[PDB]
Amino acid sequence: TWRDEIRAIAFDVQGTCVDFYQPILRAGQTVNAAKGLALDWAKLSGEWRDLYRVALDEVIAGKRPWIRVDRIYREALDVLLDRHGLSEAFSKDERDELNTVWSKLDAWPDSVEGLARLRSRFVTSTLSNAGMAAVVAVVKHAGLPFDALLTAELAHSYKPSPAVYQLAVDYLGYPADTILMVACHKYDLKAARAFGMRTAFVARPLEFGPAAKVDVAPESWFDLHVDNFTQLADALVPAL
Amino acid sequence: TWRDEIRAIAFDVQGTCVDFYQPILRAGQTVNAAKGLALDWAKLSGEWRDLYRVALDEVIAGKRPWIRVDRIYREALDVLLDRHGLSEAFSKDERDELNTVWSKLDAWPDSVEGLARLRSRFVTSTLSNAGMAAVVAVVKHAGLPFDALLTAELAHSYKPSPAVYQLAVDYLGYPADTILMVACHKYDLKAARAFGMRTAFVARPLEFGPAAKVDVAPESWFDLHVDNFTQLADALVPA
């Protein structure tokens, strides 16, 4: 089978391995307390994220120079606070400190043990859009075990550019057809498949909190489609 | 003193963290047995290193374009076999297999525990000349703990280029004066100091085998000078 030819597994990080919704809720509640406000961060996080993607789509479309993911979020925070008329309640230092949330994310309950099992049999690596320094911090904070840390910053191009997937080929040292790409975002796997990798979709229905409705429907072209990393490890590294 | 200003520590890998002398001797015993040869791998070790050094110097001087470390060694192996009249004895496949030795290097006895102690208090990273895939392989083979793996391949230029040290700043996210550079090679530390990092020299007197006389003498400009990673961790993560 193709499962026996896999040598390396590359993982998206934000969303796929770690939760950012509860970190934002926690960070925003410490802000609500220290400044006596009552902002609904459950809705604010969706607002922030929607501003981020507009700016990201402009970078991808070439309408704007390359900029690191954390800096996109930092600038969208300025727009978010202004569209809510709190620009003068938040100094730059408070905005900078609120934006550090992206480097302190929570492992999903299945992530660490499943990553550890996979590391015992494969070469494992990150491959996400975020900046290298942010992913270094996220991986360290959440205790994720990986053999390598790669991100799109090493290509100064964002997914779905083939140059991002070529980073795994060049820097892990394996051809595309021996790398499994793991993500909870379908467009990432669609690009990885076009590039020649095998694909594994992970359902993360809480990625945007309890109220959003996440697309977790199957696709015929996935190679694997799992609920969580326990199932992923049990599929690729049967333990008993 | 300055140890609470440090946020990240960057490590050279080949030599500093891992031994590459015994892996050559080990690979050579296997070759000798397979082919019925009696090659002197203690001497071939040094000859291969010397050929590598000449080729790397030509890259740094701009006489030949940037090429990955393992490919420099692979080309030097062809030259080495030609000098010893062995080109008919070794096929391309056999040379390729012999050259995998550079991804199969062994931790010095002190490396794993020292790295673990440091990672508990600092962000730790590799920063070496070798290719990314080779350092991924060496770190996994020797079980070295790191928070990040960076190499000069990410700049396509070799030490002492400032572009290499800038990788640690850009990709770990700390300014140079909060990064400590650890190496057993003085020229690397000299460049890192000029770039703005703190420096820690680790003496590796067996790096070239039991007969060589390695420069491990103290220098006034080192921030730290230690004999192994045990003493390195003792200096930076006390009690």
- Closest chain A residue to B145, measured at CA: A147
Domain with CATH 1.10.150.240 in chain A: 21-103
Whether the CB of A113 is below 8 Å from some CB of chain B: the reply is no
CATH placement of domain B2-19+105-236: 3.40.50.1000
CB contact under 8 A, B171 and A133: yes
- Residues of B within 8 A of A74 (CB-CB) are none
- Closest chain A residue to B70, measured at CA: A173
- Residues of B within 8 A of A102 (CB-CB) are none
- Closest chain A residue to B170, measured at CA: A133
End-to-end CA distance of chain B: 15
DSSP character string of chain A? -GGGG--EEEE--BTTTEE-HHHHHHHHHHHHHHTT----HHHHHHHHHHHHHHHHHHHHTTSS----HHHHHHHHHHHHHHHTT-TTTS-HHHHHHHGGGGGS-EEPTTHHHHHHHHHTTSEEEEEESS-HHHHHHHHHHHT---SEEEEGGGTT--TT-HHHHHHHHHHH---GGGEEEEES-HHHHHHHHHHT-EEEEE--TTTT-SSS-------TT-SEEESSHHHHHHHHS---
SS (H, E, C) B49-71: HHHHHHHHHHHHCCCCCCCCHHH
Dihedral of CA B141/B147/B151/B155: which sign? positive
Q: Which of A177, A182, A129, A213 is nearest to A1 (CA)?
A: A177
Question: What's the token pair of residue B197?
Answer: 């990092």
Whether the CB of A139 is below 8 Å from some CB of chain B: the reply is yes
| DSSP SS3 for B16 | coil
Angstroms from A42 CA to nearest CA on chain B = 29
Distance from C-alpha of A174 to C-alpha of A169, rounded to nearest angstrom? 5
Sheet arrangement for strand A198-202: A148-151, A123-128, A8-11, A179-183, A198-202, A224-226
Amino acid type, B220: S
Q: Measured between CB atoms, which of A123, A133, A139 is closest to B172? A: A133
Instruction: Evaluate whether A114 touches A9 at the Cβ level (below 8 Å).
Output: no
CB contact under 8 A, A123 and B139: no
What is the 8-class DSSP label of residue B110?
A: T
Residue A208 CA from chain centroid, whole number: 12
Q: Measured between CB atoms, which of A133, A170, A172 is closest to B173? A: A133
Whether the CB of A140 is below 8 Å from some CB of chain B: the reply is yes
Domain with CATH 3.40.50.1000 in chain B: 2-19+105-236
CB contact under 8 A, B123 and A140: yes
Whether the CB of A173 is below 8 Å from some CB of chain B: the reply is yes
CATH placement of domain B21-103: 1.10.150.240
Angstroms from B133 CA to nearest CA on chain A = 5
Residue B189 CA from chain centroid, whole number: 13
Whether the CB of A136 is below 8 Å from some CB of chain B: the reply is yes
Phi, psi of A27 (to 5 degrees): -65, -40
Elucidation technique: X-ray
Angstroms from A206 CA to nearest CA on chain B = 28
DSSP character string of A43-99? HHHHHHHHHHHHHHHHHHTTSS----HHHHHHHHHHHHHHHTT-TTTS-HHHHHHHG
CB contact under 8 A, A137 and B170: no
DSSP character string of A171-184? HH---GGGEEEEES
Distance from C-alpha of B70 to C-alpha of B89, rounded to nearest angstrom? 21
Angstroms from A238 CA to nearest CA on chain B = 21
Distance from C-alpha of A191 to C-alpha of A165, rounded to nearest angstrom? 8
- Residues of B within 8 A of A132 (CB-CB) are 148, 170-173
Q: Which of A151, A160, A154, A138 is nearest to A59 (CA)?
A: A160
Distance from C-alpha of B148 to C-alpha of A148, rounded to nearest angstrom? 7
Q: Measured between CB atoms, which of A134, A154, A172 is closest to B154? A: A154
CB contact under 8 A, A140 and B132: no
Among A9, A136, A178, the strongest candidate for a mutation testing the B interface, having the largest count of B CBs within 10 A, is: A136
